Amino acid sequence: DIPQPIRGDKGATVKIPRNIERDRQNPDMLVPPETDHGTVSNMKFSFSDTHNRLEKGGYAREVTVRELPISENLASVNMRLKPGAIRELHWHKEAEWAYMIYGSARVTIVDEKGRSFIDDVGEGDLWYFPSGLPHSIQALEEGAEFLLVFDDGSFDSSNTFQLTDWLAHTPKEVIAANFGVTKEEISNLPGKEKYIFENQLPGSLKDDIVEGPNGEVPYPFTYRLLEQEPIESEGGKVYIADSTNFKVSKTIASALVTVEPGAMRELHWHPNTHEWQYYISGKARMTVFASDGHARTFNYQAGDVGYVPFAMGHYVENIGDEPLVFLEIFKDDHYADVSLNQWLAMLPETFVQAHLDLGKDFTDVLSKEKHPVVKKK
Amino acid sequence: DIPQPIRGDKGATVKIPRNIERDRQNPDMLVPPETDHGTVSNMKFSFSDTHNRLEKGGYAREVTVRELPISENLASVNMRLKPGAIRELHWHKEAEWAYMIYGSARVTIVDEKGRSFIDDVGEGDLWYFPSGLPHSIQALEEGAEFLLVFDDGSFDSSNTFQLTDWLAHTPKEVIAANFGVTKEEISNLPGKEKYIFENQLPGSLKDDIVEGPNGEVPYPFTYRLLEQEPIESEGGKVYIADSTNFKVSKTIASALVTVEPGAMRELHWHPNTHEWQYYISGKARMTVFASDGHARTFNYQAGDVGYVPFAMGHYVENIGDEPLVFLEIFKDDHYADVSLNQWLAMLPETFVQAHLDLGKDFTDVLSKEKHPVVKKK
Amino acid sequence: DIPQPIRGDKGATVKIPRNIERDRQNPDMLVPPETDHGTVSNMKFSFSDTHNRLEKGGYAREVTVRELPISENLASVNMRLKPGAIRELHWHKEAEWAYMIYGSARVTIVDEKGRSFIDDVGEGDLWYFPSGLPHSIQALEEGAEFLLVFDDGSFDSSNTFQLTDWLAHTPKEVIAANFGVTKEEISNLPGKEKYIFENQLPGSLKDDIVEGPNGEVPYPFTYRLLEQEPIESEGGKVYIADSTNFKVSKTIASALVTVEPGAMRELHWHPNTHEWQYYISGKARMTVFASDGHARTFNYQAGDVGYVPFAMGHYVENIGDEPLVFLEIFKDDHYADVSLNQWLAMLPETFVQAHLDLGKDFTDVLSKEKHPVVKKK
Amino acid sequence: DIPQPIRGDKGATVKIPRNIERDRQNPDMLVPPETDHGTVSNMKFSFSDTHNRLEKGGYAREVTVRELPISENLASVNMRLKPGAIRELHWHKEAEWAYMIYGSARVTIVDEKGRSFIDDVGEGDLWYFPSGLPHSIQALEEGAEFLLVFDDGSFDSSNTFQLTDWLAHTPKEVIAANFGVTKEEISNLPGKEKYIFENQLPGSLKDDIVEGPNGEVPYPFTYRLLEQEPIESEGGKVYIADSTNFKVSKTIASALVTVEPGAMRELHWHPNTHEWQYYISGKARMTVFASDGHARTFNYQAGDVGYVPFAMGHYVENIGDEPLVFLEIFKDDHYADVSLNQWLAMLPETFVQAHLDLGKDFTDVLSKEKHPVVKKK
Amino acid sequence: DIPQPIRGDKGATVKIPRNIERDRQNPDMLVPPETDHGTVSNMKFSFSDTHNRLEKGGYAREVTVRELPISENLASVNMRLKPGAIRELHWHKEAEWAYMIYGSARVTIVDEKGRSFIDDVGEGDLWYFPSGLPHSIQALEEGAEFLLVFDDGSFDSSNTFQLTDWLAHTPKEVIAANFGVTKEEISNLPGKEKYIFENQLPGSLKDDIVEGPNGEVPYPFTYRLLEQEPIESEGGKVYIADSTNFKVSKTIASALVTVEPGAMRELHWHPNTHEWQYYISGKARMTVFASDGHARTFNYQAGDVGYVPFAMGHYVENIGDEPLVFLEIFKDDHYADVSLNQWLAMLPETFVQAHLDLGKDFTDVLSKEKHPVVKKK
Ligand SMILES: [Mn+2]
Ligand SMILES: [Mn+2]
Ligand SMILES: [Mn+2]
Ligand SMILES: [Mn+2]
Ligand SMILES: [Mn+2]
Ligand SMILES: [Mn+2]
Ligand SMILES: [Mn+2]
Ligand SMILES: [Mn+2]
Ligand SMILES: [Mn+2]
Ligand SMILES: [Mn+2]
Known about the structure:
This is part of a larger assembly, with five copies of chain A (about 375 residues). In chain A, about 10% of the residues lie in helices and about 40% in strands. With about 375 residues, the first copy, chain A, is mainly beta. In chain A, the strands form four sheets. In chain A, strands 4, 5, 6, 7, 8, 9, 10, 11, 12, 13 and 14 form an eleven-stranded antiparallel beta sheet that branches. The first copy, chain A, has a seven-stranded antiparallel beta sheet with strand order 3-22-19-24-17-16-15, with no helix packed on it. In chain A, about 55% of the residues are buried. The PDB classes it as lyase. Keywords: metal-binding, decarboxylase, rational mutagenesis, lyase, cupin, formate, oxalate, oxidase, manganese, metal binding protein, sens161-164dssn mutant. SENS161-164DSSN mutant of Bacillus subtilis Oxalate Decarboxylase OxdC. Chains A, B, C, D, E are oxalate decarboxylase oxdc.
């Protein structure tokens, strides 16, 4: 059918040419709640509305501050690699966090003490590469598709430093001198960057492990998130990885949230920093409460990026018949939330009653235990 | 069917949950031309991805720098009024330009010399209200739906000053003193803004014209754009309104472009300023050439806002079976373009040949006359 | 008596040590109108709260963006010269406008074509010195006290270039070479700036007029404001000087307003730019209407600077038993206002009635003629 | 010999490894005048301290805000073309002004109305290309070397839009459609930009003139500066080109100054804007007087860029045995200066005497006529 | 001879007046490597191109963001003191790090707990003064010349707070009250700052040590860098001082590098922050790799400041017949580098081979041990 921006006696039918498919995706934007008011910045952007960089071996597309300007501190890439395909040895200024949505990959990293770390990452696993440390990704037999998050919103997929690009823009006599070889011995160096390139599947992980004189890295750069015990509440599950458990992840704190049909990520805020969101699957709405009677509701589905500025009140409701699965990402050394329910539960009941103009029947339902995801009765 | 980000031996199938409806809308983004390269800011945003403010009498939604950050100088509102409905008497810092897409409306404006202008605007007509001059809009019997453009990208639909809001936040004793009336005589003033409100259809325009001691306004604030003779070329039509013909329109220059199926707005740039676009109907692609081998292709359809930063090379191709109709908007006192074809046509042929590594067979097709819209052979 | 921040059942007595003299000066700030709401920047600053630079021959104190940060575009100095005292030959980046409050002075200016202008300025007269043109001020037999306005809020009373400071920081051999004199002939040049210095009263103006080969300046740099015919309305008078009458005053438009006891500068706004205010005498309150239900009331008296950001609604009410006299200053080539009364007077009465929920008894009082200052019945 | 930073009883010998060649070039920096004081930004940069971009047909090097950060509004390129060599058809956001130091060149420009201008420029001639208008340069039989000035300090020699780069990053099917040709007919288009390329010398200018249906350009884009009558004073000559004589040059005002040995560009300032300088030949020093007892002396020679911020006092002294030749450039529609001598000459003598603590013997030397360049006695 | 900007069939001879001495100093700028491409900010500035402030007792010159705008975080002063001469007791906002190039000096510092530290510093020694802690420098019998680095690029050698300047701008009655003395007892206080002043050589260090009731400072403010064991590699030596060994040096990490003739500081980057460089002696070139095929080569010699923005790839090659000696400075709590050689050495050989299109003959030369300085075969 044909939705219209009408809510009771407010609004009217659309009389101009329009985007009915987008309107159907955004029911709470075409017809917002009556409780939305005021100007709030855009908090939603789809990867499907971005240019896809296609290469021999995969693709990459990005959502940055040039797409979603509220998100000044965090940017993201959706990258896909075919089986065996290599994301070329490189480094950048930004720290990088990743979630493996599909398939598997082998990653390498060498630190500033010359210690190497090589590991395989599968679905529901993470990595985190500290700023400036060089690394690579190679998809295994299934290929790989993953979400990358960088701790600067201004991230530009080509301020990125590629091994072969560096060598291509260094005098041959200097490269030769650097390694103690002749110019002739390095004549076959590539003339331009590879970036993403096809390659044969690697061998077993155990055969690739490189030993060295500098020892083992003190902390691993990968994390098995979905192998951890989640916080389980009536309507879903929350798995948290921050610097307290994923020790190297100093600048990125994360949570994977699953919300059953008929459930919602409860009313809460974050007392530490901005939330950046990625919608892996399902369909949601969220109202962002911005203070001073400002609130705006957004719809999200698979492929969408969301955002909640620092300490703004919000919830995330499953509005579909499949599980809703999304990530909550923060540029911090820890994950923290304040639950509306738990806050009020921990105050004197008559004090809460004085605020809400409600009685004991209400304060009696409050829970001193935090349930991040609640289920509709 | 199910589109995939594959172009020959580049790219791969999407393995994660995705937005197939958006992918279908963006065929040149999911699979860009091989000639696209480099980072370019986002130049596309849909009104359908915005919150719709619903009121008794209509609605309004906006695309600003908070949605499309490349557009720092220009912002827009899509506003809809039911028959008789009134957009409340108000003013703002920004100059306002408008295009009537559907229906008709009566506008009022009073200038800083106390001269009034009241007129009816129909489909294909414009208005322009200089910064700070107070005005109103009232839809006639068909209702009205129109595109508003404001000459600051930071425009906020509530930095806007409403008559009733001003009075509601002024002491009653001051209002009384201002008009020489008692407080009792103004006790029925509204306690809050109206913004958009239902009202009876007005009478004939001739009956509303207000005479005064200060004379006629020197220049009209409305323009009948589609009543002008357009530039007609093989594939379409261009109608231009800038300060040279629509004399009051000092800060906004505009063109309505119609592109037939199988036609394209030719390769050109603007030597004066940034282009802001609104897609009224149809389906397009445009490649934005950003210099230094940077180029990025965007898809557009009805409801979309586009942008072309100052002097960037571009074209707009109809990729559908209906006419493509769009506006080209500029924060300037004039419209100007440089045509690629006309530029090369006006140079010595052997000089052009030396640049393009092409011969007389090519330079022979060049035209010294500018054809803004060309048709495919 | 002892005022308290109490308005009906709102507020409470002050329990901490306090500034009762300031509270008495600010009755509409300690107890604002109930109609004030929201956050508005500070729009008030007293010259009495500034450091006074004392010199042999006078003093100078300033209100800049470092004191009143809302005022980014305009800054001011209150300067006083004793009889005969000289404000040293100097220039600066900013254009300078002045109002002579007390006494009289002789000014000099030489333009970029070597044309000189020398004139005497008395009470109620203005000057304006274009950016970069060098000038001086010398008080006559009464001394002089005047208000200077500069067209940058960042003005710093010592980014100012003084003749003697320039020479003191130029090599003596270069000064000698510049003038064709010996180093010995310029040995008595001052070692540091004079800035303000005592001097004998000058002779008659006619005896100082310097003739030259380059002709007369095309436009005078002084204006007799109080010799013009003012706009006279029931409650007071307005005298306007802008580039339309004071031809050289391209970047500063001004109005001197006098408001009788029981009168008020009517509800209005400026459609062109920010208003900067100086309170010469008397006592006022003004409510600044900032949109979106934001309004804040300020008190002013002699020595105070005020401000009204671009297009904000306001009035200025005399709250004392003496005339209120103030300046309205604008960084523009013209003065413009929109009167609330005149605006509504020039619209169809039933349309105004539909907005205000008031009848013909109200619309019947509206005036098509602008009365800048109205008197209480 | 070995200069030392010693001035009387101040300073000391340099004890660390040092740059004696640079010290010899900068005698007034290693040993400044005793009258210099305070912090002043750097106002000097050499083209010899820049990377030279070498191409088949010439070279180009630039001084921008990334080299000389005081100069935010103006940037420059030193470009050299071999005989016949072509600076590829291109356009950019910035207006461009040029001075032909060596040789000659043919320029083309086509405006936004499709009117073409083609002309030959020799030594001492100028051009000016308005922002966004496309143009080219081709060296004649002597080759050419010229100074380009752009009206943004942030200018980047590759935000520049090249014809062949645009076509290389446009889909072939679109180029074909644009011109009404087949893809095969344009298969030989270059795959990358040319920028500067070798070519055969052109024919006579008269044979290249392109006629068209759109008429002659209203104003020429070249100017014969050294064919004008200069202001001649005792020590040198000044030739001025601004929008008053070189009518198209709206954003750049210029003066070529020649200063004989033993002469100096007199003590002056500019009341309009910042001065940007290029030293064509000879050796200079200049003291920049920055107000508040801040002054700093700089040395310049051939290849150096200088700067004088808006209204700062300065002189330029020939400190060599050959003529000093330099350009004074301003981002404005006019050239203006205030002469120290002429300023004081046009004031009452006793008033000047009261300031300088000097007598009639000094004021008697002052000249009411402006002499931009004076000669040492 | 006369160098020319010619590289094979690219470039051309210089036809305009030029700076041949500077061209000789910059052979890799006049004729860059063919591998340089793109726009890179200036990364080079000479102390010889700065104003030298001469005082009785020495001199000081500075390179700040006003000279080298890429360096926003770090600024430097080259200061020279004669025997016995004193850099006046002072403090500033910035932390200060120093390297003693010539001679020796006694420093004092008193901390916020009233603990004093007095020590002698000789050639190759460092100091570091935390932000805000007051200090002095007095040259011993040889005099002293040293490089100071401050942890803000905006450092201004006179935002610096001098003891005697503070007292000169404090009311005498307050100074008297502060110390319990009469105004007469302090009448001989200086009227202006000393800054640098001549004085008799001090006595032995042991005789100056001041005891107090507050104890010993926990960490020393001086460091004997050249007394540490360096990292020695085939072509040179590296001595590192950061907060891990020079415990107080929290905001500055440093390395003194010596590179033998025929050697080079190897291809590396810093994963932590920007590098600021000072060239103590010898002659170098460095290519800075900026990503996305941007690279630019710079020449340096004694007296030059260099810079490498965060994580950019670089090397520093000795291009002379004497040792090259330079400092690498970082605004961080630690020194870190990633070696290109070591990075590749610690990865699987076939993976490196897949990237470089080279075989086992190349990967066989890689070293798992880091050699910061390598020697040409
Ligand atoms: Mn990465
Ligand atoms: Mn959350
Ligand atoms: Mn409006
Ligand atoms: Mn266009
Ligand atoms: Mn002045
Ligand atoms: Mn006003
Ligand atoms: Mn150009
Ligand atoms: Mn000048
Ligand atoms: Mn210090
Ligand atoms: Mn380094």
